[PDB]
Short mmCIF file of all heavy atoms in Angstrom, two decimals:
data_model
loop_
_atom_site.label_atom_id
_atom_site.label_comp_id
_atom_site.label_asym_id
_atom_site.label_seq_id
_atom_site.Cartn_x
_atom_site.Cartn_y
_atom_site.Cartn_z
N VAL A 1 84.01 124.23 98.11
CA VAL A 1 85.36 124.76 98.02
C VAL A 1 86.12 124.24 96.80
O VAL A 1 87.23 124.72 96.52
CB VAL A 1 86.16 124.41 99.30
CG1 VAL A 1 85.51 125.02 100.51
CG2 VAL A 1 86.35 122.90 99.42
N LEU A 2 85.56 123.26 96.11
CA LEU A 2 86.30 122.69 94.97
C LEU A 2 85.80 123.09 93.61
O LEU A 2 86.60 123.36 92.69
CB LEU A 2 86.28 121.16 95.03
CG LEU A 2 86.96 120.50 96.25
CD1 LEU A 2 87.09 118.97 96.03
CD2 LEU A 2 88.32 121.12 96.53
N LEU A 3 84.47 123.26 93.40
CA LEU A 3 83.92 123.47 92.09
C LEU A 3 84.27 124.84 91.55
O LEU A 3 84.27 125.85 92.29
CB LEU A 3 82.41 123.24 92.11
CG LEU A 3 81.96 121.80 92.19
CD1 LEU A 3 80.45 121.66 92.02
CD2 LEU A 3 82.70 120.94 91.16
N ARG A 4 84.55 124.86 90.25
CA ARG A 4 84.91 126.13 89.59
C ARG A 4 83.71 127.04 89.46
O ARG A 4 82.64 126.64 89.06
CB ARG A 4 85.48 125.79 88.19
CG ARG A 4 85.72 126.97 87.28
CD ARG A 4 86.41 126.51 86.01
NE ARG A 4 87.71 125.91 86.28
CZ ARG A 4 88.41 125.18 85.41
NH1 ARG A 4 87.92 124.94 84.22
NH2 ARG A 4 89.58 124.68 85.77
N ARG A 5 83.93 128.30 89.81
CA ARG A 5 82.94 129.35 89.50
C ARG A 5 83.38 129.99 88.16
O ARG A 5 82.73 129.75 87.12
CB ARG A 5 82.89 130.41 90.61
CG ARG A 5 81.99 130.02 91.80
CD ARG A 5 82.53 128.88 92.59
NE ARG A 5 81.81 128.73 93.85
CZ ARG A 5 81.87 127.68 94.65
NH1 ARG A 5 82.63 126.63 94.34
NH2 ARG A 5 81.18 127.66 95.79
N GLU A 6 84.44 130.77 88.18
CA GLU A 6 85.09 131.28 87.00
C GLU A 6 86.40 130.60 86.84
O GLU A 6 87.04 130.17 87.80
CB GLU A 6 85.29 132.80 87.08
CG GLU A 6 86.00 133.25 88.32
CD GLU A 6 86.13 134.76 88.42
OE1 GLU A 6 85.58 135.46 87.52
OE2 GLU A 6 86.76 135.26 89.38
N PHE A 7 86.84 130.47 85.56
CA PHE A 7 88.12 129.80 85.27
C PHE A 7 89.26 130.60 85.86
O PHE A 7 89.42 131.79 85.64
CB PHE A 7 88.30 129.66 83.76
CG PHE A 7 89.64 129.08 83.36
CD1 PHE A 7 90.05 127.84 83.75
CD2 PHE A 7 90.52 129.86 82.58
CE1 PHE A 7 91.28 127.32 83.37
CE2 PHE A 7 91.74 129.34 82.21
CZ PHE A 7 92.13 128.08 82.62
N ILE A 8 90.10 129.90 86.65
CA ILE A 8 91.29 130.48 87.23
C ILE A 8 92.51 129.97 86.47
O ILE A 8 92.88 128.80 86.65
CB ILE A 8 91.39 130.18 88.75
CG1 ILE A 8 90.20 130.78 89.48
CG2 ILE A 8 92.70 130.72 89.31
CD1 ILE A 8 90.13 130.40 90.94
N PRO A 9 93.14 130.78 85.65
CA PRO A 9 94.32 130.31 84.92
C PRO A 9 95.50 130.10 85.87
O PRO A 9 95.59 130.71 86.94
CB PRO A 9 94.62 131.45 83.95
CG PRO A 9 94.05 132.66 84.61
CD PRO A 9 92.83 132.20 85.35
N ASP A 10 96.39 129.19 85.46
CA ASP A 10 97.58 128.96 86.23
C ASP A 10 98.54 130.16 86.08
O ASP A 10 98.91 130.50 84.97
CB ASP A 10 98.28 127.70 85.73
CG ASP A 10 99.68 127.53 86.32
OD1 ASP A 10 99.85 127.83 87.52
OD2 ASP A 10 100.61 127.11 85.58
N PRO A 11 98.93 130.80 87.20
CA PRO A 11 99.90 131.91 87.08
C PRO A 11 101.28 131.48 86.70
O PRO A 11 102.07 132.33 86.27
CB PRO A 11 99.86 132.54 88.49
CG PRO A 11 99.45 131.39 89.37
CD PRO A 11 98.50 130.58 88.59
N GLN A 12 101.63 130.19 86.81
CA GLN A 12 102.88 129.70 86.29
C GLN A 12 102.84 129.48 84.77
O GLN A 12 103.87 129.12 84.17
CB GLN A 12 103.29 128.38 86.96
CG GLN A 12 103.97 128.59 88.30
CD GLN A 12 104.47 127.27 88.94
OE1 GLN A 12 103.92 126.81 89.93
NE2 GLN A 12 105.49 126.66 88.33
N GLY A 13 101.67 129.69 84.15
CA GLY A 13 101.61 129.64 82.69
C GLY A 13 101.56 128.23 82.08
O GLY A 13 101.80 128.08 80.90
N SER A 14 101.26 127.20 82.89
CA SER A 14 101.11 125.86 82.34
C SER A 14 100.09 125.85 81.21
O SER A 14 98.96 126.39 81.38
CB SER A 14 100.68 124.89 83.44
OG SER A 14 101.63 124.86 84.50
N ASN A 15 100.43 125.26 80.10
CA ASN A 15 99.59 125.22 78.92
C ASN A 15 98.96 123.83 78.78
O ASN A 15 99.06 122.99 79.65
CB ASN A 15 100.38 125.66 77.68
CG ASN A 15 101.60 124.77 77.43
OD1 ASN A 15 101.69 123.65 77.89
ND2 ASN A 15 102.55 125.31 76.66
N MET A 16 98.29 123.63 77.62
CA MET A 16 97.63 122.34 77.41
C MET A 16 98.58 121.27 76.89
O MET A 16 98.28 120.06 77.06
CB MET A 16 96.44 122.52 76.46
CG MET A 16 95.31 123.35 77.04
SD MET A 16 94.71 122.72 78.62
CE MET A 16 94.15 121.07 78.10
N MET A 17 99.67 121.63 76.25
CA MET A 17 100.75 120.69 75.98
C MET A 17 101.23 120.07 77.29
O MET A 17 101.48 118.85 77.38
CB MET A 17 101.89 121.33 75.22
CG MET A 17 101.60 121.64 73.78
SD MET A 17 101.35 120.18 72.75
CE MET A 17 103.03 119.52 72.65
N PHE A 18 101.36 120.91 78.33
CA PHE A 18 101.70 120.37 79.64
C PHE A 18 100.60 119.47 80.21
O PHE A 18 100.89 118.36 80.68
CB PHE A 18 102.04 121.50 80.62
CG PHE A 18 102.15 121.05 82.04
CD1 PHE A 18 103.33 120.54 82.51
CD2 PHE A 18 101.05 121.11 82.89
CE1 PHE A 18 103.44 120.09 83.81
CE2 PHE A 18 101.14 120.65 84.19
CZ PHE A 18 102.35 120.15 84.66
N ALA A 19 99.37 119.93 80.16
CA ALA A 19 98.27 119.18 80.74
C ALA A 19 98.14 117.78 80.13
O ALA A 19 98.03 116.79 80.86
CB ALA A 19 96.98 119.96 80.62
N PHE A 20 98.14 117.72 78.80
CA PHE A 20 98.02 116.41 78.15
C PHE A 20 99.29 115.59 78.32
O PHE A 20 99.19 114.34 78.29
CB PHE A 20 97.68 116.60 76.68
CG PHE A 20 96.25 117.07 76.46
CD1 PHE A 20 96.00 118.23 75.76
CD2 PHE A 20 95.20 116.32 76.95
CE1 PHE A 20 94.69 118.65 75.55
CE2 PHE A 20 93.89 116.73 76.77
CZ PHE A 20 93.63 117.88 76.05
N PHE A 21 100.43 116.22 78.48
CA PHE A 21 101.67 115.44 78.75
C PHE A 21 101.59 114.79 80.11
O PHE A 21 101.93 113.61 80.28
CB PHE A 21 102.91 116.33 78.67
CG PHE A 21 104.19 115.58 78.71
CD1 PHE A 21 104.86 115.24 77.54
CD2 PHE A 21 104.74 115.20 79.93
CE1 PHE A 21 106.08 114.55 77.61
CE2 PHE A 21 105.94 114.49 79.99
CZ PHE A 21 106.61 114.16 78.81
N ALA A 22 101.14 115.53 81.13
CA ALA A 22 100.98 114.97 82.47
C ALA A 22 99.99 113.83 82.44
O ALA A 22 100.23 112.76 83.05
CB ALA A 22 100.49 116.06 83.44
N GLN A 23 98.86 113.98 81.70
CA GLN A 23 97.90 112.90 81.60
C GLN A 23 98.51 111.71 80.88
O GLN A 23 98.43 110.56 81.35
CB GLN A 23 96.66 113.39 80.87
CG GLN A 23 95.49 112.41 80.88
CD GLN A 23 94.27 112.94 80.13
OE1 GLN A 23 94.38 113.84 79.31
NE2 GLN A 23 93.11 112.35 80.41
N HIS A 24 99.18 111.94 79.71
CA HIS A 24 99.74 110.84 78.96
C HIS A 24 100.83 110.14 79.72
O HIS A 24 100.86 108.89 79.80
CB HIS A 24 100.25 111.37 77.61
CG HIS A 24 100.93 110.35 76.77
ND1 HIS A 24 100.24 109.50 75.91
CD2 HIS A 24 102.24 110.01 76.65
CE1 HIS A 24 101.09 108.70 75.29
NE2 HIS A 24 102.32 108.98 75.72
N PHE A 25 101.77 110.89 80.32
CA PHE A 25 102.91 110.33 81.01
C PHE A 25 102.46 109.49 82.21
O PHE A 25 102.90 108.35 82.37
CB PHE A 25 103.90 111.44 81.41
CG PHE A 25 104.96 111.02 82.36
CD1 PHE A 25 105.96 110.16 81.97
CD2 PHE A 25 104.97 111.51 83.66
CE1 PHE A 25 106.97 109.78 82.85
CE2 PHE A 25 105.97 111.14 84.55
CZ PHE A 25 106.97 110.27 84.15
N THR A 26 101.60 110.05 83.06
CA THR A 26 101.23 109.32 84.30
C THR A 26 100.26 108.18 84.02
O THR A 26 100.10 107.31 84.88
CB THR A 26 100.61 110.28 85.30
OG1 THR A 26 99.49 110.94 84.73
CG2 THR A 26 101.63 111.31 85.78
N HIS A 27 99.63 108.13 82.84
CA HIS A 27 98.73 107.01 82.54
C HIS A 27 99.48 105.71 82.35
O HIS A 27 98.84 104.68 82.11
CB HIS A 27 97.89 107.32 81.32
CG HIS A 27 96.51 107.82 81.67
ND1 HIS A 27 96.32 109.11 82.12
CD2 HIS A 27 95.29 107.26 81.57
CE1 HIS A 27 95.02 109.31 82.34
NE2 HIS A 27 94.37 108.19 82.00
N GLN A 28 100.82 105.69 82.43
CA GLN A 28 101.54 104.44 82.34
C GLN A 28 101.74 103.78 83.72
O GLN A 28 101.94 102.57 83.77
CB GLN A 28 102.90 104.62 81.67
CG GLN A 28 103.98 105.34 82.46
CD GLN A 28 105.19 105.69 81.63
OE1 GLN A 28 105.96 104.82 81.24
NE2 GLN A 28 105.38 106.98 81.37
N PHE A 29 101.71 104.56 84.82
CA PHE A 29 101.86 103.94 86.11
C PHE A 29 100.68 104.18 87.05
O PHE A 29 100.67 103.64 88.16
CB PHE A 29 103.18 104.34 86.79
CG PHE A 29 103.48 105.83 86.73
CD1 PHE A 29 102.84 106.73 87.56
CD2 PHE A 29 104.47 106.33 85.86
CE1 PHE A 29 103.13 108.08 87.52
CE2 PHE A 29 104.75 107.69 85.81
CZ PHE A 29 104.08 108.56 86.67
N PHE A 30 99.70 105.00 86.65
CA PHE A 30 98.41 105.08 87.32
C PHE A 30 97.40 104.34 86.46
O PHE A 30 96.77 104.91 85.56
CB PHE A 30 97.96 106.54 87.58
CG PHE A 30 98.92 107.33 88.41
CD1 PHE A 30 99.15 108.68 88.18
CD2 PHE A 30 99.61 106.72 89.46
CE1 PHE A 30 100.05 109.40 88.94
CE2 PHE A 30 100.52 107.45 90.24
CZ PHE A 30 100.72 108.79 89.99
N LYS A 31 97.27 103.01 86.69
CA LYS A 31 96.35 102.13 85.92
C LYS A 31 95.55 101.34 86.90
O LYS A 31 95.78 100.14 87.10
CB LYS A 31 97.15 101.24 84.94
CG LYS A 31 97.92 102.01 83.88
CD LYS A 31 98.33 101.08 82.73
CE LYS A 31 99.30 100.00 83.18
NZ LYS A 31 99.61 99.02 82.10
N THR A 32 94.57 101.98 87.53
CA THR A 32 93.84 101.37 88.62
C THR A 32 93.02 100.19 88.14
O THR A 32 92.30 100.26 87.13
CB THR A 32 92.93 102.42 89.30
OG1 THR A 32 93.74 103.46 89.84
CG2 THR A 32 92.10 101.76 90.41
N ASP A 33 93.12 99.05 88.83
CA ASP A 33 92.33 97.89 88.58
C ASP A 33 91.08 97.95 89.43
O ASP A 33 91.05 97.37 90.54
CB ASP A 33 93.13 96.63 88.82
CG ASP A 33 92.37 95.36 88.42
OD1 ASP A 33 91.30 95.50 87.80
OD2 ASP A 33 92.86 94.25 88.73
N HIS A 34 90.02 98.57 88.92
CA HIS A 34 88.79 98.71 89.69
C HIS A 34 88.06 97.40 89.91
O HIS A 34 87.20 97.36 90.78
CB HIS A 34 87.90 99.76 89.04
CG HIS A 34 88.40 101.16 89.18
ND1 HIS A 34 88.22 101.90 90.32
CD2 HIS A 34 89.11 101.95 88.34
CE1 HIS A 34 88.78 103.08 90.18
NE2 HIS A 34 89.32 103.13 88.98
N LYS A 35 88.37 96.36 89.13
CA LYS A 35 87.80 95.06 89.42
C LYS A 35 88.14 94.63 90.84
O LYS A 35 87.29 94.05 91.56
CB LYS A 35 88.29 94.01 88.42
CG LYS A 35 87.78 92.63 88.73
CD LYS A 35 87.96 91.66 87.57
CE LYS A 35 87.30 90.31 87.86
NZ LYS A 35 87.32 89.41 86.67
N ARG A 36 89.37 94.92 91.29
CA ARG A 36 89.77 94.62 92.67
C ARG A 36 89.44 95.78 93.61
O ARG A 36 89.00 95.54 94.75
CB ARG A 36 91.25 94.27 92.73
CG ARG A 36 91.61 92.98 92.03
CD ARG A 36 92.85 92.35 92.64
NE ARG A 36 93.03 90.96 92.20
CZ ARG A 36 93.95 90.55 91.33
NH1 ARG A 36 94.81 91.43 90.82
NH2 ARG A 36 94.01 89.25 90.99
N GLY A 37 89.68 97.01 93.19
CA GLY A 37 89.43 98.14 94.02
C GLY A 37 90.37 99.30 93.72
O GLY A 37 91.34 99.17 93.01
N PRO A 38 90.06 100.47 94.31
CA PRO A 38 90.92 101.67 93.99
C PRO A 38 92.35 101.55 94.52
O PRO A 38 93.20 102.32 94.06
CB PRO A 38 90.16 102.81 94.71
CG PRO A 38 89.36 102.12 95.79
CD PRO A 38 89.00 100.77 95.24
N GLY A 39 92.63 100.64 95.44
CA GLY A 39 93.99 100.42 95.91
C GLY A 39 94.83 99.47 95.09
O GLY A 39 95.93 99.14 95.50
N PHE A 40 94.33 99.03 93.93
CA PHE A 40 95.04 98.06 93.09
C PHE A 40 95.38 98.68 91.74
O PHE A 40 94.74 99.61 91.29
CB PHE A 40 94.20 96.78 92.90
CG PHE A 40 93.97 96.02 94.17
CD1 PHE A 40 92.92 96.38 95.04
CD2 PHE A 40 94.76 94.94 94.51
CE1 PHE A 40 92.71 95.68 96.20
CE2 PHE A 40 94.57 94.23 95.68
CZ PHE A 40 93.54 94.60 96.51
N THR A 41 96.42 98.10 91.11
CA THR A 41 96.92 98.64 89.84
C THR A 41 97.16 97.54 88.84
O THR A 41 97.40 96.37 89.20
CB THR A 41 98.22 99.42 90.06
OG1 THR A 41 98.68 99.92 88.78
CG2 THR A 41 99.30 98.53 90.66
N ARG A 42 97.07 97.89 87.57
CA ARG A 42 97.42 96.99 86.44
C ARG A 42 98.84 97.19 85.94
O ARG A 42 99.31 96.39 85.13
CB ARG A 42 96.45 97.19 85.26
CG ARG A 42 94.97 97.03 85.57
CD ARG A 42 94.16 97.81 84.56
NE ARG A 42 94.24 97.18 83.24
CZ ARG A 42 94.35 97.86 82.08
NH1 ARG A 42 94.40 99.20 82.10
NH2 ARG A 42 94.40 97.22 80.91
N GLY A 43 99.50 98.29 86.37
CA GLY A 43 100.84 98.57 85.91
C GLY A 43 101.87 97.91 86.77
O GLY A 43 102.41 98.53 87.68
N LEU A 44 102.16 96.64 86.47
CA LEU A 44 103.02 95.86 87.33
C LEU A 44 104.48 96.31 87.25
O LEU A 44 105.27 95.98 88.14
CB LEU A 44 102.91 94.36 86.98
CG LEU A 44 101.49 93.78 87.12
CD1 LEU A 44 101.45 92.27 86.96
CD2 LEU A 44 100.86 94.19 88.45
#
């Protein structure tokens, strides 16, 4: 139910400036410390 067969574009028109902005912006508070585990973070 998850894997892509054919590419389904976003009907809201989200572009790649949006996609990379979401990645860049959220990478400041989603900083998982996998040394401890998936429930831990480095973004204090």
Side-chain angles (χ1 to χ4, degrees):
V1 301
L2 297 192
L3 285 187
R4 171 174 298 165
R5 277 68 168 167
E6 54 183 3
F7 174 63
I8 298 174
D10 170 40
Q12 278 184 249
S14 302
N15 58 21
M16 293 304 300
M17 288 294 288
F18 168 84
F20 287 124
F21 189 98
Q23 189 181 19
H24 176 85
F25 168 69
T26 57
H27 264 73
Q28 73 189 290
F29 47 76
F30 300 144
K31 298 197 295 175
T32 298
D33 185 9
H34 287 280
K35 176 166 186 173
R36 293 207 167 108
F40 296 83
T41 180
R42 304 156 69 221
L44 301 188

